[PDB]
Amino acid sequence: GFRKMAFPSGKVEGCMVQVTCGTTTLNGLWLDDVVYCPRHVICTSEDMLNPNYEDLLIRKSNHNFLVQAGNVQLRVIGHSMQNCVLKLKVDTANPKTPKYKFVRIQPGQTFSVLACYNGSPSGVYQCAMRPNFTIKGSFLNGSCGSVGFNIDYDCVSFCYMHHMELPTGVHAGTDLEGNFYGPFVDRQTAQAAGTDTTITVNVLAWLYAAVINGDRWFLNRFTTTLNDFNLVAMKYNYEPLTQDHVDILGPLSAQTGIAVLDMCASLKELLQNGMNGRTILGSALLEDEFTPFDVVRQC
Amino acid sequence: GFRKMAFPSGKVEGCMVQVTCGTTTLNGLWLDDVVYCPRHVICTSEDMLNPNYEDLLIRKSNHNFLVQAGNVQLRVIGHSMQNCVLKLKVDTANPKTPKYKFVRIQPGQTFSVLACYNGSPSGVYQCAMRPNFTIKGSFLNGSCGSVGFNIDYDCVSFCYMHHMELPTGVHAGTDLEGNFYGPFVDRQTAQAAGTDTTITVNVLAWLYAAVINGDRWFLNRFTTTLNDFNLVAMKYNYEPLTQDHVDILGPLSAQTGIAVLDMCASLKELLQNGMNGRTILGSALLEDEFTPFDVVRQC
């Protein structure tokens, strides 16, 4: 079988707290004795249009921040700002702190999102960093400070903190150093992203997944060069395929005995013709939010 | 705009253990001082075609069961069989036991699965119980004893425990009282699922979701009786609606002001005429794995 699969979220659930300043409430991440959260918690409705965050922060005291782990209030003993992330030092360490790292992911890479409201986890799902640095998430009011992450041998790699929604319904945020992915800004304005593209290496991974699970109507006897595939890919606003990408697909190629460039020839035919009403793994659309690693692990 | 979202898995992660007999290891669920697992952990390969579980259990003693949380052994102090589940009394009450219930779900209901191997969680995903009492999971060897669950106001409702795969690649299992969903048995014999059908109540939920988001071209000014709709539905391999289905659509019907039987009339028209090249929620296919509760959550 094959489904979109998220990492188990327990290690991150143990770190989620509620952070309140004024009449603004969102989520924070409690690691050791520090709570990380979006800096726009310090804004008011009038501030959010063109906020001078340095000015706004100097006017705040430690006692203006209300941090709550469940029913328990945590005392803020210091605060600083790192790009778009506020760091609140608290006097108690989180015993539930996992082994962790802060990473900045590359477009095309996937991660799990733990969506939280008022410091309480609500759901978990798998996202990809779009090539235009948006993410197609499910985030409502109060979700800010929800984080995205991957897990590797009990170590949690935090890669995303949520900040905003765009008019098209996609989302934008930062890494845990507070730098936005993409050309976005934490001000209350309608922002557009650059033109998105489809993550080609992931579509190929997913086609290999469809084959591993016995779905093959789209395979063909033809083949293609890497450059000629990339010309057609770019015409249809697919990302070009690098030789690193070809190499990353090897294990799936071997597992199925289908050369990478043969699968490229199949994808080319789908782009040029369509799916003729047929479906792949249930979908009427080509899916590009499974990486090669994702497919392997689950297969 | 909608995606499969799982419940945060942490409360369930804290209950997963491994249960071994000889070299056969699967997963178990540790709640208070009882571990629940599939009874076929007591089978050798020779026993699995036509096991005499009652006879196999008589030869078992407490000291034959290796239960481990991680690498830490949990001593077994009693054992009993309840239908297709083994219950192992252990000498330690699980300190991470959540508030919980055992529930038996209906076809069409959705739940999160925490896929586990050797007592270690690998991933979490959302499943729907199909009308033929199979699920389309992602399960590998050693996944038995993985559980499906819903979470309501901090209470975990356990509804599924995994036991087997069917030739078509779908999966079958029991509730936590050990009664299989569907006509299946825990024997290593070839078994067939009934022909599957589309989950009508979930398609209706999906149409309500489309209306909530402003996509409502398919609404018409007609209605139908429940019986007339059910008789048409069956001719298109749609599940007939129950009174419980009508009731769980209540909130969405209230939210939109569209009576359930009016929406049924719109669906009937879609079934009899097709989509005429149009889309709903950006899809030419009707989705049937989002329940009325799922829709409310994400909307």
Curated annotation (Swiss-Prot), chains A, B:
Inhibited by pyridone-containing alpha-ketoamides compounds 13a and 13b. In turn, alpha-ketoamide 13b (tert-butyl (1-((S)-1-(((S)-4-(benzylamino)-3,4-dioxo-1-((S)-2-oxopyrrolidin-3-yl)butan-2-yl)amino)-3-cyclopropyl-1-oxopropan-2-yl)-2-oxo-1,2-dihydropyridin-3-yl)carbamate) inhibits SARS-CoV-2 replication in human lung cells. Inhibited ex vivo by michael acceptor inhibitor N3. Inhibited ex vivo by compound 11a and 11b. Residues 1-299 are cytoplasmic. Residues 1-299 form the Peptidase C30 domain. There is a cross-link at K4, K89 (Glycyl lysine isopeptide (Lys-Gly) (interchain with G-Cter in ubiquitin)). It is found in: Host cytoplasm; Host Golgi apparatus; Host nucleus. The active site is at H40, C144. It catalyses: TSAVLQ-|-SGFRK-NH2 and SGVTFQ-|-GKFKK the two peptides corresponding to the two self-cleavage sites of the SARS 3C-like proteinase are the two most reactive peptide substrates. The enzyme exhibits a strong preference for substrates containing Gln at P1 position and Leu at P2 position. Cleaves the C-terminus of replicase polyprotein at 11 sites. Recognizes substrates containing the core sequence [ILMVF]-Q-|-[SGACN]. Cleaves and inactivates human TRMT1, preventing tRNA guanine(26)-dimethylation of tRNAs. May cleave human NLRP1 in lung epithelial cells, thereby activating the NLRP1 inflammasome pathway. May cleave human GSDMD, triggering alternative GSDME-mediated epithelial cell death upon activation of the NLRP1 inflammasome, which may enhance the release interleukins 1B, 6, 16 and 18. Also able to bind an ADP-ribose-1''-phosphate (ADRP). 3CL-PRO exists as monomer and homodimer. Only the homodimer shows catalytic activity. Interacts with host FBXO22; this interaction promotes the proteasomal degradation of nsp5. This is 3C-like proteinase nsp5. It comes from Severe acute respiratory syndrome coronavirus 2. The gene is rep. The chain holds residues 3265 to 3563 of 7096 of the full protein.
